[PDB]
Structure formats: C-alpha cells, structure tokens
C-alpha cells in the first residue's frame, strides 16, 4: 500500500538518510485539476504529478481553490501514488489562524484542555488523513496588521503540542512529519521555543537580501539563536521563485533577471540568491538539512527587471515574465545536483578519523558527514577500552567539553590531537587513563588542571604542562595535582626538566569575590583618603590567591617548585592586576546624605555607609568610621500622616514614602503640608528633595522650591483630634500657629540644614515660592534624628 510507502519514506528523512534536502511549495491553484468557486479550472499549464525526484518534500500550499474542486481528489489517489514512487512526500501546510482561534476549526472549540485536544485530533483528520498526505506543516509569520493575543499565542502552542502527540516523532502516528515554517527570529518566536523538541524541521524564510555584504547576515544571527533549540540537519532555508504580477514588498530577486537576449535566463543558477542559499552553511552545530523554493510551479522564469521594482496593485506594470507557462523544473534539479555533489556532504570516513572505535562515537554523537566535524560544539564523551588512538579529534576544532572516559589503552594525548578550543578554554575531562604514558598540554592557555584525574595516570612516563596560565603557588590546588603528576614519573623514570616540564605559567587575573574589611577606620589628620586604594583593592587567581600590589606580584613570580620557578620571566603585574575603571563608591554619611566619590577628607567625627559597585552590581559594602563615629540618624518623617494641606490629601503623603517617583504641587506657588510623626523623638537635621529629584518623570530646575519654611506646632498642649474637620484645616493654615524652626531660601536639587534639637510630634512645611513662573514641585521630605 501507499501508507506502508509513505511510513517508509517519511522514517528515510527523519533518519537522515537523503543527505541534503530540496524542497517545494507549491501553489494548488497552478495544478490543473484546480477549479475556483465558480467550478472553473483556473490554470492548466502545470500539475504536481510532474514534480521530479530532485525534489524530497513537496508542501501543498492552498489557496484559491475551492472545497470541492476535482483537485483534492486528484491528490488524494493519484498524485500521492505517483509521487511516493519516486521517493517524494507530500505536506500540508496550514497557518497559525487554525490554530488560535481565527480561522477555520478552531473557531468551533473552546479554549480548554479538553477542546484544545479535540481541536488538534479534527486538524488531523482533515488536514493530513483525509488529504492523504504524509505530513502537516503549520505556518507562523508576522502579523502586520492586527497582531496576534498572547493567549492566542498561548493557545497555537497549546494545540500544536497536542498534535504533536498524535503525528511527528515523539506522536503516536511516527509515519506522518512534523514541520514548523516560520519568518520569525528566536526572541519573537514564543510557539517555536515550545515545540522545538517534537519538531522534524524548521524552514525559516530568507526571501530577498538578509543584509550585510553577503547578503546573508540575518541568517547567521538567527542560526546563532536557533542552535540552542533544534539541530543543524533540522534547519531549512528558504527562496522564492517569482510570483506572476508579484508587485512592491513581494518581489525578492532570488533569481535571474529576464534577458531579452537569452530566453533561458531563468533557469540558470549563477549568480542567484538560490545558489548562494544552496551553499550556504551554519558556522556552528552542523551542517543544514537542505534549502526549499516558494512557488516550485515557477521554476525557471526569469525575474522582472529591477526597473519595475516599484510597481502596486494600483500602478501596474506588467511585464512578459508575468505570464504563466509550463515548468521542466530546472532550476529545483540543478540546485539539488549542486547540494548532493558538496563535498561536505561526503560522510566521515577511515581518512580523518583512523580508530574505528573513535569513529563510531564521534559519528554518533558529531553527526555523519566531513562538514560536521568543523562545525560542532557541544559536548563530546568519548568511553571504552577499544579506543587506541586519538588521531582526528584534532577536526573538532569548536568542540566546548571532551571528557575521556576510561580510555584504558590510550598512550598519548598531545596538543595535536586536541581541538583548537582547548587554547580557549574549553573544558576537559579525563577519568581513569591507566593506560596514558605522555600527557603533553603545553601552550594550551589553561588556567586550571581542574577534571584531570591524576591519581589513575599510573603508567605516566613524561608530561608536559609548560606555557599555560596555572597558579603553581603553595597553596594552590593545581600545585597538589602537579606533585602527583611528578611522583606518577618518579615510579616510571628519573624526573628531568624536559620529562616534568611545567614553566612559563602566565596566571590571568580576576576580581576577589569578597573583600576582608567589614568595618574601616581614619583618624582625624585633615587629609584625603582613597577608600578604593585602602579597602577594595586586589587580584585573585582563578584558584584564589590574592595578590594585593605589585610588590606582592614580585614574590609571586619568584615561587617555585624543587627550586624550578614556575611563572614566565616577563610576564609583568600591569598584564595580570585588573584596573578598577568602572567602579563607583556610594556612600551614605550620618545624617544621610548621599554623595558619589572614592575619596573622603577626615576633618571631623563621622561615620560613613559603604557601597562600592563595579557599574553593575555592588561588589562591596562596609562601615567606615572618622574619629569617634557619629550614631547612624533616622528619618522620623518616613510614613509620616498626613493631617492637613491646602493642595490635594493623597498627593500630599506621597513625600513621606521612601520614593522620589511623585511630586507634591497646588494651583499656585504657595502651598503647605502638616503633618505628624505619630510619637515625639528628636530631630537635628532636616532634607528636602526638590522637583529636579522627580525619577518617573524628567523636571527641569524651573519647577523647584525656591524660598520655604519647616515649622513646629507653637501650642504644644493642643489636642487637635478633638477640634473638626473645618476648624482643624482652617487653624493649621493660620501661620502664628507655628514658630519656624528651618528657613530655605536656595532653589538646589537636594536643600540639607540644621535644626536645634527639635522635640516636637507635629510639623508644617510651607512653600512660599518657586524658581520661576510656574508651580513649583517637590517629592520628599526628611526629618532626621534618633530614637
Ligand atoms: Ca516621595
């Protein structure tokens, strides 16, 4: 039968069995058993049955005709048979409207698990079994006009995960494909993060220039993305062949011009983006599974002239390409010759890889042709006892982890079996190598022996650890392994410089994690202090030894090991310290004010709250005393209620939250607010944040208090819970009800004076006008203290 054909073609693609791969859309209304609603045939120049055997999947992409047009039927029993003889299978393709509630089924079920599952298995049925294809591919564009609902993105996904438990690879029916297509990059595409994992391919659109030189830049970026979800040999690119009276924003010149001078322009392939896509490879992960064309039914027609780029369904421009006519499918054929004959295609053979055992394993996990091997990087394990030689594995040259496991019969491993990523900082596993006798890394910039394991090295006869960047200090981990490395020699042989080498070590610097001083301390000299130079200061290996000044760097380098000095002659402190360029010094003082600099000048007793940051987190904080100290002040005001105001009450206790997001302003330049600290503590300093502070929206200074007044309440035997609400108002704007205790009269971003040890437990501030016209704005106010 040709369902038992079709399983067995669809399990020849999902294992990789065609190498690379060509593909078509093409158009149900260019076949000509197509009708339109009117029961017209609309095109008969072409037909599918005439689809060769270059092409590996082709993708029934339908529009125009109608639902009972003679074509479904010609698909279903004759087209599908003919096709699957040559080795071909067929795709439905359908848009993400099927799926999200838009369009078609989905409009007839509701949006719950139970209707989402019923959704999926009705687009199955009548999508992919009663159409008698071998797949379904669900389309997922941009959506210009009318985007698309985060719940109807929620629910595509949903209903593309149940139909991927019905069809696909990890579905019940495994002879049926799975396809996304998609013009959307990675960080846009929330549907395909979620069902990359039951995915067989991916055909991502490049239609037209992708910018850059090569024209090619915004595929290389999105590969960069998409590796981290689904394989290379899963990755399918795109091009399209001319649409008939294609007008401006759908035509791509992915192919040839017309040339009046040469009729079979059209169909030839150099020069055109079709054949730089066809050559076109990933610069990691692998090689890609193939290229497909848009419109396969105009294979072969030349292009319009550039000169009728700008034509609209307005402004017509028609042109002799934009006529229909038959199709050989040339240019599908000659693309698919060009991608079979790439010779990177040519699997991995004894010539690179000599060890049969290493060949499988690599295979297995690397992928299997020669163009693989430059590409991956991922993990490589690489186990067993039948493995000899480790010739090749030179060819992974962007591999990110090798492990060896128990490589018994292993004699040698050298920089020249190893990829070049191991000279930038690849990370290697070695378990169990009773087998090696030379453990060569030398000149491999490796700033750890970390994963080694040196204990099972028992036949060691000669290693060579020179020219990498290790910390050989004494109390440096890599020390104790260097020592078993040279008692495993000892057993073997007479220790040599040339047989145990492990000089000219170049350490890289880093910053210290922590910093030892909690709490620092000045005297009183009347000079300035770096608190960068005195308390944050500092290198560190990668195993921890600090390193705090050049001096320090000076004995460091004069370490050695059996009198054999291990760091490199000229290696110098200005290549191994870290500069400090980015980093700031916050620092909040008694009465707290804030101030940004690395330097203080100890006149008086003081005490300092510490943040040092390195431009993106704080990566330090102490205490700092001058002299005595001071006693860390309060804001008394915070949460302060509000008990009267001439301008609006819920603006108004908005400056006494912690923020500067808000402001406090009245139809006027003249304003107060009254308030009241709940219980009576002492007050010796107070702050205003003026309107320029304003951080949810940018003020210009124009806008701040210029002149104001901070006032006690003059009775302090007054009950005013007792007087009303018209009385009390009226009474905490009569002004000879407060005494001024705080007089500002200077417009600055921040004003800061000092009180004379204010008791008292209700307060006034008074705005008595701006820096300008225009009402002026503030958004805290502080009242600073103890207790
Ligand atoms: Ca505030």
């Known amino acids: 039968t040709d369902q038992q054909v079709g399983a067995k073609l669809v399990q020849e693609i999902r294992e990789g069995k065609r190498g690379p791969l060509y593909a078509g859309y093409f158009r149900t209304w260019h076949d000509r058993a197509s009708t339109g609603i009117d029961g017209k045939q609309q095109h008969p120049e072409n037909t599918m049955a005439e689809v060769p055997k270059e092409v590996d999947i082709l993708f029934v992409f339908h529009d125009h005709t109608a639902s009972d047009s003679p074509f479904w039927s010609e698909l279903k029993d004759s087209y599908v048979h003919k096709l699957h003889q040559q080795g071909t299978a067929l795709v439905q393709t359908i848009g993400v409207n099927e799926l999200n509630g838009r369009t078609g089924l989905s409009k007839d079920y509701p949006d719950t698990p139970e209707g989402n599952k019923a959704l999926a298995a009705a687009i199955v049925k009548a999508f992919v079994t009663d159409r008698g294809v071998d797949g379904l591919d669900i389309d997922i564009e941009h959506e210009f006009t009318n985007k698309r609902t985060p719940e109807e993105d929620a629910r595509a996904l949903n209903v593309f995960k149940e139909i991927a438990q019905l069809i696909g690879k990890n579905g019940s029916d495994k002879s049926k494909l799975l396809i996304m297509d998609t013009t959307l990059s990675v960080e846009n595409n929330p549907i395909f993060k979620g069902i990359a994992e039951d995915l067989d391919y991916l055909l991502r659109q490049y239609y037209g220039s992708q910018g850059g030189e090569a024209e090619v830049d915004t595929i290389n970026s999105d590969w960069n993305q998409y590796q981290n979800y689904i394989d290379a040999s899963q990755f399918m690119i795109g091009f399209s062949f001319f649409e008939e009276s294609a007008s401006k924003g759908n035509l791509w010149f992915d192919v040839n011009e017309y040339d009046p001078n040469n009729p079979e322009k059209g169909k030839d392939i150099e020069g055109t983006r079709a054949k730089k896509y066809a050559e076109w490879q990933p610069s990691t992960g692998g090689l890609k599974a193939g290229i497909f064309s848009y419109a396969i039914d105009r294979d072969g027609v030349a292009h319009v002239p550039s000169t009728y780029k700008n034509r609209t369904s307005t402004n017509l421009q028609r042109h002799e390409v934009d006529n229909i006519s038959h199709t050989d499918?040339?240019?599908?054929?000659?693309?698919?010759?060009?991608?079979?004959?790439?010779?990177?295609?040519?699997?991995?053979?004894?010539?690179?890889?000599?060890?049969?055992?290493?060949?499988?394993?690599?295979?297995?996990?690397?992928?299997?042709?020669?163009?693989?091997?430059?590409?991956?990087?991922?993990?490589?394990?690489?186990?067993?006892?039948?493995?000899?030689?480790?010739?090749?594995?030179?060819?992974?040259?962007?591999?990110?982890?090798?492990?060896?496991?128990?490589?018994?019969?292993?004699?040698?491993?050298?920089?020249e079996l190893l990829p070049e990523s191991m000279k930038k900082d690849a990370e290697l596993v070695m378990v169990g190598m009773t087998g090696l006798?030379?453990?060569?890394?030398?000149?491999?910039?490796?700033?750890?022996?970390?994963?080694?394991?040196?204990?099972?090295?028992?036949?060691?006869?000669?290693?060579?650890?020179?020219?990498?960047?290790?910390?050989?200090?004494?109390?440096?981990?890599?020390?104790?392994?260097?020592?078993?490395?040279?008692?495993?020699?000892?057993?073997?042989?007479?220790?040599?410089?040339?047989?145990?080498?492990?000089?000219?070590?170049?350490?890289?610097?880093?910053?210290?994690?922590?910093?030892?001083?909690?709490?620092?301390?000045?005297?009183?000299?009347?000079?300035?202090?770096?608190?960068?130079?005195?308390?944050?200061?500092?290198?560190?290996?990668?195993?921890?030894?600090?390193?705090?000044?050049?001096?320090?760097?000076?004995?460091?380098?004069?370490?050695?090991?059996?009198?054999?000095?291990?760091?490199?002659?000229?290696?110098?402190?200005?290549?191994?310290?870290?500069?400090?360029?980015?980093?700031?010094?916050?620092?909040?003082?008694?009465?707290?004010?804030?101030?940004?600099?690395?330097?203080?000048?100890?006149?008086?007793?003081?005490?300092?709250?510490?943040?040092?940051?390195?431009?993106?987190?704080?990566?330090?904080?102490?205490?700092?005393?001058?002299?005595?100290?001071?006693?860390?002040?309060?804001?008394?005001?915070?949460?302060?209620?509000?008990?009267?105001?001439?301008?609006?009450?819920?603006?108004?206790?908005?400056?006494?939250?912690?923020?500067?997001?808000?402001?406090?302003?009245?139809?006027?330049?003249?304003?107060?607010?009254?308030?009241?600290?709940?219980?009576?503590?002492?007050?010796?300093?107070?702050?205003?944040?003026?309107?320029?502070?304003?951080?949810?929206?940018?003020?210009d200074s124009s806008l701040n208090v210029a002149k104001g007044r901070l006032q006690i309440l003059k009775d302090t035997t007054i009950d005013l819970e007792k007087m009303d609400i018209k009385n009390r108002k009226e009474y905490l704007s009569?002004?000879?009800?407060?005494?001024?205790?705080?007089?500002?009269?200077?417009?600055?971003?921040?004003?800061?004076?000092?009180?004379?040890?204010?008791?008292?437990?209700?307060?006034?501030?008074?705005?008595?006008?701006?820096?300008?016209?225009?009402?002026?704005?503030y958004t805290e106010l502080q009242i600073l203290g103890q207790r």
């Open 329 to 415: 499918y040339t240019v599908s054929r000659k693309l698919k010759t060009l991608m079979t004959e790439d010779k990177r295609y040519d699997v991995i053979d004894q010539k690179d890889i000599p060890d049969p055992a290493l060949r499988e394993q690599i295979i297995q996990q690397v992928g299997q042709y020669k163009g693989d091997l430059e590409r991956y990087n991922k993990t490589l394990v690489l186990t067993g006892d039948k493995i000899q030689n480790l010739k090749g594995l030179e060819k992974l040259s962007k591999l990110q982890k090798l492990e060896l496991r128990q490589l018994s019969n292993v004699k040698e491993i050298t920089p």
């Open 437 to 699: 006798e030379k453990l060569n890394l030398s000149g491999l910039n490796r700033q750890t022996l970390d994963g080694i394991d040196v204990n099972s090295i028992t036949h060691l006869t000669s290693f060579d650890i020179s020219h990498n960047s290790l910390d050989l200090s004494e109390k440096s981990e890599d020390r104790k392994l260097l020592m078993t490395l040279m008692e495993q020699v000892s057993n073997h042989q007479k220790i040599t410089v040339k047989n145990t080498a492990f000089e000219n070590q170049k350490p890289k610097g880093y910053y210290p994690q922590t910093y030892d001083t909690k709490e620092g301390h000045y005297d009183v000299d009347n000079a300035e202090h770096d608190i960068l130079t005195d308390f944050v200061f500092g290198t560190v290996t990668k195993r921890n030894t600090f390193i705090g000044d050049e001096e320090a760097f000076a004995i460091y380098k004069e370490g050695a090991v059996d009198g054999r000095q291990y760091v490199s002659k000229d290696y110098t402190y200005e290549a191994f310290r870290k500069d400090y360029k980015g980093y700031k010094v916050h620092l909040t003082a008694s009465n707290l004010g804030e101030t940004v600099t690395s330097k203080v000048t100890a006149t008086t007793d003081e005490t300092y709250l510490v943040d040092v940051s390195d431009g993106e987190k704080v990566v330090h904080h102490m205490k700092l005393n001058i002299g005595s100290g001071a006693i860390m002040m309060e804001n008394l005001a915070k949460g302060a209620k509000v008990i009267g105001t001439s301008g609006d009450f819920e603006q108004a206790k908005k400056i006494f939250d912690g923020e500067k997001s808000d402001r406090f302003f009245t139809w006027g330049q003249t304003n107060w607010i009254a308030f009241d600290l709940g219980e009576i503590n002492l007050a010796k300093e107070w702050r205003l944040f003026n309107a320029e502070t304003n951080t949810e929206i940018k003020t």
């Open 734 to 777: 009569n002004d000879e009800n407060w005494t001024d205790v705080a007089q500002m009269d200077d417009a600055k971003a921040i004003f800061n004076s000092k009180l004379s040890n204010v008791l008292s437990r209700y307060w006034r501030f008074c705005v008595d006008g701006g820096a300008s016209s225009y009402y002026p704005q």
